[PDB]
Symmetry: C4
């Protein structure tokens, strides 16, 4: 549809800021956590991939977030904002698609309602004219009866 196309620039804005959310937390994770957890945060590539695993729910079983929380108790100030902001972006990707569809339906229902009323207005006036003409004929008839 050419109303989904309407919503694509905003989708890229969300998708763009989503990958930027990974990079800023990937750098952050490397400094905070890389020395104690080289396998998970020892580098930017290692951090970006550890963050990816957390978001794709391959971290319930081998839950990277939790052993880091053990060694560093305040580590939730890192993880909780990450999981929240990156879930909220993924949410907005679907919302933008949902809103695009429901907006197109809503606009279509409103043209339906205007021409629905514009039809009723047409028909009510047209049937008044029809009643006018028959009535004006009767007047002219009664007028010839006087002549």
């Amino acid at each position: 549809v050419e109303s989904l196309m309407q919503a694509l620039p905003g989708i890229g804005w969300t998708a763009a800021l989503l990958l930027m959310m990974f990079y800023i937390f990937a750098v952050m994770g490397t400094e905070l956590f890389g020395e104690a957890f080289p396998q998970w945060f020892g580098s930017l590539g290692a951090s970006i991939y550890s963050l990816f695993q957390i978001m794709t729910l391959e971290s319930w079983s081998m839950g990277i977030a939790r052993p880091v929380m053990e060694v560093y108790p305040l580590a939730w100030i890192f993880f909780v904002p990450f999981i929240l902001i990156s879930s909220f972006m993924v949410l907005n990707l679907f919302i933008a698609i949902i809103v695009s569809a429901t907006q197109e339906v809503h606009e279509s229902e409103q043209r339906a309602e205007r021409e629905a009323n514009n039809l009723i207005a047409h028909d009510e006036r047209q049937e008044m004219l029809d009643l006018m003409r028959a009535m004006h004929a009767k007047i002219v008839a009664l007028e010839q009866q006087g002549a």
Copy 2:
């Protein structure tokens, strides 16, 4: 409501660029201030948390911003843009919610006006038809009197 749903992608754009503002000023604060103030800016994690305290009005009493200003007189070129842009983003988070509500009310009031007028238009024309029919009948009555 499913009109607050409509404003969420823009909320995330503001929320995303807000955390972006911390990271860019956290890096800048580390470079400018980390050597003279290692407890406050000696690292990216230290800088990000010093900036957080400033925005959460903790530094109303120990005031991190001001002793840095004292050693570095130009330091307001760092702090003033930070406090302004970060506050303006937090402001836009609430504005986006306020505008979402007031726009839903405004759209309701407009449908209320449009069927208010469409009702008056219907009633005024229906009343004319009623007047028509009683008149037409009287014409036909007087026409019978001539026959």
Copy 3:
């Protein structure tokens, strides 16, 4: 036109996040690839220019992306998101211009419809008045015949 003016702030948002996409992948490319490929990723300036060549379809013949893929088999986790997100932004630059034009046309057509109906409504009622007045006159004529 002063409706393309309306779409410019969103154009800059796309253009801004596009150059953002280069920088974040330029840093990531340097870390991942700079040691094995110093001519292509040994620095941030080298990485930003290698990414530029890939997007401008220069690497259709010397194909920087592919020998990196050969040494690093996982390298598509870097290249594929890059080519997708950067192309999707460039796409949204043209969409924003297309949507701006088609929306100005759509709004024109709607004013054209609304005065099209407002004209028909005026003419149908004015024609009824004209019918009224000629009728009223004939009533008064026949009323004089009775006097």
Copy 4:
């Protein structure tokens, strides 16, 4: 006005990405230019302030951009995108304010035009009723003349 408030979240988006435009070119400028031009790009703080001078037109007389162009001939690939993208952001700050005002005027003119037509529609039908009633009275008068 509470329609300027409507436009503020988009203003922050432009203002946000503007400061991000400085930081990414400030890092870029430091690596490309810092070794040969330590006074202008030797650090991130030095680069961010050299970029500021260029944009605030304190670089015609002491034109930092030009001696760098001399030593590095391809340096316009850095400066030209910088000056363009950061001018285009500042432009969009004023456009967002202009569009906010002209939109409020345009919406106000359209309510003026609807109640202008809704008044004409009211008055034309009301004067038809007035002509109805006088006419129906004449019919009843001529009907009593027959009785």
